Design a protein around this ligand. Structure first.
Ligand SMILES: [K+]
Ligand SMILES: [Zn+2]
Ligand SMILES: [Zn+2]
Length: 221
């Protein structure tokens, strides 16, 4: 089950009853770089994992899901301070959408001249929205200093974010902000904490499984 905006620009694919992936194309010189997050359909509103590349996409994304599920976006979890995750933080703040992050992610956002998310997430934080349970986990440095994962214990679904490379990624990508000697250890910390995983969402590329974590480990060798 897959739904595109008017344009190609934005797509949502259904994973299960109350969980979808959101994907948006960012436009870079000779063109399209897609980015993924999650949409959680809860009894108390829509909760997103991550925003998008910029404000224009972020608005359009909110407006699509609010229309479709007939409820407001109330909360977003920002999983690190690069533009594909936090690009639409301005839109979030101005609409009264709570933007959750670790304090490190918030510090880095401010350092890079983005508006500040909440800095409310700890190394392990458990949230509940309606009946929907969500855990955030800081496994250590990898793709960036601050990168976190998100876990839906009710579905054993892991949002890997940009810590986790898709099967189509044949290299680590941009590592300016990365910690390639700790990234393996951070991935291992994810595998140790979540020992039975039903689906893994990478920050870019196709949805997979535990094999994506092993793919990323191979990529680090
Ligand atoms: K339950
Ligand atoms: Zn990133
Ligand atoms: Zn990314």
């Amino acid at each position: 089950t897959v739904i595109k905006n008017e344009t190609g620009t934005i797509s949502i694919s259904q994973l299960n009853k109350n969980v979808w992936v959101h994907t948006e194309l960012g436009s870079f010189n000779g063109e399209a770089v897609p980015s993924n997050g999650l949409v959680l359909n809860t009894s108390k509103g829509l909760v997103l994992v991550d925003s998008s590349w910029d404000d224009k996409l972020t608005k359009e994304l909110i407006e699509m899901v609010e229309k479709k599920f007939q409820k407001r976006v109330t909360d977003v979890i920002i999983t690190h301070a690069h533009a594909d995750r936090i690009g639409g933080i301005k839109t979030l703040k101005e609409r009264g959408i709570k933007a959750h992050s670790t304090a490190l992610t918030a510090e880095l956002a401010k350092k890079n001249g983005y508006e500040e998310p909440l800095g409310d997430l700890q190394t392990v934080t458990n949230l509940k929205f309606g009946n929907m349970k969500v855990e955030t986990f800081y496994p250590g440095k990898g793709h960036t200093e601050d990168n976190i994962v998100v876990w839906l214990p009710q579905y054993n679904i892991l949002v890997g974010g940009c810590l986790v490379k898709s099967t189509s990624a044949k290299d680590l990508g941009n590592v300016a902000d990365a910690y390639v000697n700790e990234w393996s250890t951070s991935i291992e910390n994810v595998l140790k904490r979540y020992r039975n995983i039903n689906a893994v969402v990478p920050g870019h590329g196709e949805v997979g499984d535990k094999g994506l974590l092993l793919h990323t480990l191979d990529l680090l060798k």
